[PDB]
Write a protein that binds this ligand. Structure first.
Ligand SMILES: *[C@@H]1O[C@H](CO)[C@@H](O)[C@H](O)[C@H]1NC(C)=O
Ligand SMILES: O[C@H]1[C@@H]2[C@@H](O)CCC[S@+]2C[C@H]1O
Ligand SMILES: [Zn+2]
Length: 1016
């Protein structure tokens, strides 16, 4: 049956948390290998019957945006690299080249004439040009959500299958800033057999090198059996550039980068230039180079050695192709003909290297270790830990998650039907997928690009959001209109999307008010979509032009609603206070929408001349000294005023929250009898060093622990309603909001760091929880990994990515913070959680970006806070490296990442309107998600095909019986199923033809893909 992911601790040779506890992390000078040691080898190791096989693998790192935009790099550099690669590989049959970034390759190939397309296909087919990974990008591994890692991988590999007829099975990840086990998870489920990584902490490289553990079978932290394992090669040295890839001595290796002799504007910082290889020097030059190779080979277990040959945007000029190729050819001729070296060296590809490694393994020459864990937080040297980019450019980090959801929703909503080409559905979805995929680049979501490049990514993402909205609203109109009435104009807006959290109140006033009135329009239809495969009820809100509005379902059943004011916060430069103003012409109406699995539900908003029977009105209390009046137009309850004071609130039967006089949480009481548990929010600031290394987009180099933000006497606004209550406070740089709807609170921070240079703003939670040095953070929204704070490491080393959540716990109590955006965070003392909100840095951090981070803009960060008793939960043992969410924390995460979508009908009357879609869809167990639903065929295909990605998480058992659900068989969601197949996660290979055309559900922590085929 399924593997147990909780109770059995895997036995692995290397467990990265255990390794971290034992390592000392001393930064001593190792000689020419500055972070290693002087490698020694026995010359007699190699001989006539046991040669060293060397693969020199030419490559070119092409960032899809960084210090230029994608299109700028394409025009100035990448199109010439690819054009000249085609020519030089064509003309030089033993030369090889690998290529990773399919965004660029697709941009290139589609501009080729057919003669050149054919020539390109021939050098791919014959193995000279080899694709590695084949994703749209080489993604960030820290901030990216696994769903978007899969999206971009699929975008690139689907392109490659269609146009190049190849599917890579080896991955190349030389530049992401630390590495995640989510990558082998996805890759192994996508047909891969091997992967390569580079940017791991220098101390880890030393430790694993000493044990010859740089090649390993990387399995997931919970995986007892090993079925998730993927063979992984970690490169051993400081960079992927030629000085750090031939061997341990960069002064020697630089002499073999033949672009550095002067005419190209490059040189060797170790002050010994390359020399052109001639018959007079080739023996000496070869003895230098072979000795470097044999030292590198000592770090690995086979007689097969990988030597990358490349750097950023290399292999551009024809003269560069020639100078590298001709000099290496002279070296190979000499080396391979001189028996005393016992070396056979050649240009090769990545797959060629791995195939030869595994041939050695099968011949019994090596056994590889098993490994679990991750490779965060990266440091490349000294105390320079790359935890800054977990937060840099947080606006765009948040935008990533918004677009993630709208791509899912657009693909799902439109998959139910086949569309005519004139509807431009496929066109808009392809654009949306590609812009989101581009942003997964390790200079996109990471916030490590130049200002104008960030603007380009943002503009692309905005176009993608508009594309999603168009597809979604067309789809809703089709799904909810009587078929014989449906008369679409595929350019028309039948609905507009309403999003309450993006860009957010205080960031952009982009929401449309529903305008009702006796002399204009009595009522309005709205529609909610639920992308999750279970019934959901959730409060939804809209802006309306009257407070006298009531809600009905499309059976005209009244729905209870609450009306509240529309409050906006202002930085009053004449009074020097931050305080709220209420609208006198628009109001918020809130009600519970109940929406089928993967379905839609319609409601109607109707105006009346007076308070309606089933609509209540929130009270409002402004706490501040010196108040002034707050008129609210027709809102029927007058605002109350008071001096600052502690307050407590409870919605429904839910928790009771107590707040300080400054508007910040102080305690949570779960039930009426129970203790008021201390849970205190605090905002603090980190600065920058005034000597030594400065923080920048990549690096976090604080000048000591954080200092509290001075709050003064902030203005606090309390809104109390039957359905929703909140406490909001205007603090320096942050409008902080705690919202209660009857379960776990929601936190919203409108963060505007303003002109506070050299400041990082952190939000900290202080509790009594006896967590010691342990805390948990997620990896890519997929899994939670145990962290241990290490006081032998500096503060910034104890920061980890928080892509979706974090928690601390003791024997009895857990506090989980779920996020709607990836940010950096830690637990720096027992009972604490902290998460960075924004950072503004005036200096560059000396990694090549050439600017600090001075382009901050207001961002609305969102969270859920879940305090729980966990003493009755079945948790992993103390030695297990994973943790798992409870039901309530998982649902709270889903609330943030995949909320209901809201649609407002744009015209005055919707003729043929229907009340619901998907009432017959199965309501699957809470731990299962349909992560992807995508129609894979256009309308001309006689056999339509729909793909599904199913993911089951693992939730802790805590004694909530929580049961009766329906089985979900995705292959029967559409009618006329003729076949159901299990596929790789990219949909590109059929793995099993399924009996009865039934797609089984998956095991906890597993992800599977299915394709259903339909004959009508
Ligand atoms: C793709 O490759 C397979 C074997 O590599 C070959 O049989 C086939 O003709 C190619 N199909 C295409 C070009 O779609
Ligand atoms: O962000 C950049 C990388 C970083 O490692 C700094 C050195 C250049 S690489 C190219 C970019 O992706
Ligand atoms: Zn890069």
């Amino acid at each position: 049956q399924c593997q147990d992911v909780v109770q059995d601790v895997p036995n692995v040779d290397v467990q990265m948390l255990e390794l971290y506890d034992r390592m000392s992390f001393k930064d001593i000078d190792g000689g020419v290998w500055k972070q290693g040691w002087n490698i020694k080898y026995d010359p007699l190791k190699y001989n006539a019957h046991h040669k060293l096989k060397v693969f020199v693998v030419p490559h070119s790192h092409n960032d899809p945006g960084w210090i230029q935009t994608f299109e700028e790099y394409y025009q100035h550099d990448t199109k010439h690299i690819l054009s000249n690669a085609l020519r030089h590989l064509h003309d030089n049959p033993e030369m090889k080249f690998i290529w990773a970034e399919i965004s660029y390759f697709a941009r290139f190939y589609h501009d080729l004439g057919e003669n050149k397309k054919l020539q390109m296909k021939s050098i791919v087919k014959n193995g000279q040009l080899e694709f590695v990974t084949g994703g749209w990008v080489m993604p960030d591994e820290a901030n990216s959500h696994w769903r978007n890692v899969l999206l971009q991988l699929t975008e690139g590999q689907t392109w490659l299958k269609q146009f190049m007829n190849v599917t890579p099975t080896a991955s190349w990840a030389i530049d992401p800033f630390g590495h995640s086990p989510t990558m082998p998870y996805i890759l192994q489920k996508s047909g891969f057999k091997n992967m390569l990584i580079q940017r791991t902490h220098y101390s880890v490289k030393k430790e694993l090198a000493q044990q010859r553990q740089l090649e390993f079978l990387w399995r997931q932290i919970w995986d007892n059996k090993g079925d998730t394992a993927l063979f992984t090669h970690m490169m051993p040295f400081y960079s992927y550039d030629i000085p750090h890839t031939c061997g341990p001595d960069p002064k020697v290796c630089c002499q073999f980068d033949f672009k550095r002799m002067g005419s190209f504007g490059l040189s060797c910082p170790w002050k010994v230039p390359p020399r052109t290889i001639s018959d007079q020097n080739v023996a000496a030059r070869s003895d230098l180079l072979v000795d470097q190779w044999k030292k590198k080979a000592e770090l690995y277990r086979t007689n097969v050695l990988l030597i990358p040959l490349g750097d950023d945007f290399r292999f551009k000029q024809n003269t560069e192709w020639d100078v590298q190729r001709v000099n290496y050819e002279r070296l190979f001729e000499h080396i391979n003909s001189q028996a005393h070296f016992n070396v056979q060296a050649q240009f090769g590809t990545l797959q060629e290297y791995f195939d030869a490694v595994h041939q050695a393994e099968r011949a019994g020459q090596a056994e590889f270790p098993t490994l679990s864990g991750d490779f965060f937080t990266y440091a490349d040297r000294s105390d320079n830990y790359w935890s800054g980019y977990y937060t840099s450019r947080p606006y765009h980090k948040r935008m990533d998650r918004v677009l993630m959801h709208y791509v899912r929703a657009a693909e799902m909503l439109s998959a139910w039907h086949s569309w005519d080409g004139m509807a431009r559905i496929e066109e808009r979805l392809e654009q949306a997928r590609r812009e989101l995929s581009l942003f997964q680049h390790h200079d996109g979501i990471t916030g490590t690009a130049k200002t104008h490049v960030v603007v380009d990514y943002e503009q692309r993402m905005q176009e993608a959001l508009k594309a999603c909205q168009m597809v979604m609203q067309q789809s809703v109109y089709r799904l909810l209109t009587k078929p014989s009435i449906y008369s679409p104009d595929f350019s028309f807006s039948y609905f507009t999307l309403d999003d309450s959290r993006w860009p957010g109140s205080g960031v952009e006033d982009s929401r449309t008010t529903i305008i009702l009135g006796e002399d204009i329009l009595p009522s309005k239809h709205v529609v909610m979509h639920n992308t999750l495969p279970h019934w959901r009820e959730q409060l939804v809100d809209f802006y309306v032009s009257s407070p006298f509005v009531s809600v009905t379902d499309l059976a005209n059943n009244p729905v209870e609603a609450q009306v509240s004011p529309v409050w906006s916060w202002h930085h009053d430069t004449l009074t020097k206070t931050i305080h709220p103003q209420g609208s006198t012409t628009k109001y918020r109406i809130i009600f519970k929408a109940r929406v089928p699995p993967m379905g839609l539900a319609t409601y109607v908003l109707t105006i009346s001349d007076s308070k309606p029977e089933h609509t209540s009105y929130a009270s409002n209390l402004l706490l501040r000294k010196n108040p002034t009046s707050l008129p609210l137009g027709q809102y029927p309850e007058d605002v109350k005023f008071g001096d600052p004071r502690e307050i407590s609130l409870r919605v429904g039967n839910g928790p009771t929250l107590a707040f300080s006089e400054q508007g910040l949480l102080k305690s949570i009481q779960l039930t009426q009898d129970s203790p008021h548990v201390p849970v205190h929010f605090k905002f603090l600031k980190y600065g920058v060093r005034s000597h030594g290394d400065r923080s920048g987009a990549y690096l976090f180099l604080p000048n000591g622990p954080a200092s509290p933000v001075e709050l003064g006497q902030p203005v606090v606004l309390v809104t109390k309603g039957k359905l929703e209550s909140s406490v909001s406070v205007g603090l320096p740089s942050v409008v902080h909001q705690t919202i209660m709807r009857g379960g776990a609170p929601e936190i919203r921070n409108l963060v505007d760091i303003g002109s506070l240079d050299n400041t990082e703003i952190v939000m900290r939670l202080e509790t009594h929880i006896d967590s010691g040095d342990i805390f948990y953070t997620d990896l890519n929204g997929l899994q939670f990994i145990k962290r241990r704070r290490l006081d032998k490491l500096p503060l910034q080393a104890n920061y980890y990515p928080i892509p979706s959540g974090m928690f601390i716990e003791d024997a009895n109590t857990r506090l989980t913070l779920l996020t709607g955006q990836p940010l950096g965070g830690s637990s720096l003392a027992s009972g604490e959680l902290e998460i960075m909100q924004d950072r503004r840095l005036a200096s560059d951090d000396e990694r090549g970006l050439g600017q600090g981070v001075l382009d901050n803009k207001p961002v609305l960060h969102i969270y859920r806070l879940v305090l729980e008793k966990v003493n009755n939960c079945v948790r992993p043992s103390k030695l297990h490296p994973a943790g798992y969410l409870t039901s309530a924390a998982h649902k709270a995460s889903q609330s943030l990442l995949d909320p209901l979508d809201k649609f407002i009908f744009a015209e005055n009357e919707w003729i043929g309107a229907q009340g619901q879609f998907g009432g017959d869809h199965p309501s699957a167990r809470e731990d299962l998600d349909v992560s992807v639903m995508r129609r894979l065929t256009k309308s001309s295909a006689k056999t339509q095909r729909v793909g599904y990605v199913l993911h089951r998480t693992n939730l802790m058992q805590c004694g909530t019986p929580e049961e009766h659900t329906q089985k979900l068989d995705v292959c029967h969601l559409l009618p006329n199923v003729a076949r159901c197949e299990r596929t790789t996660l990219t949909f590109l290979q059929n793995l099993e033809h399924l009996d009865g055309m039934v797609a089984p559900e998956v095991c906890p922590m597993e992800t599977a893909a299915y394709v259903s085929s339909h004959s009508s």
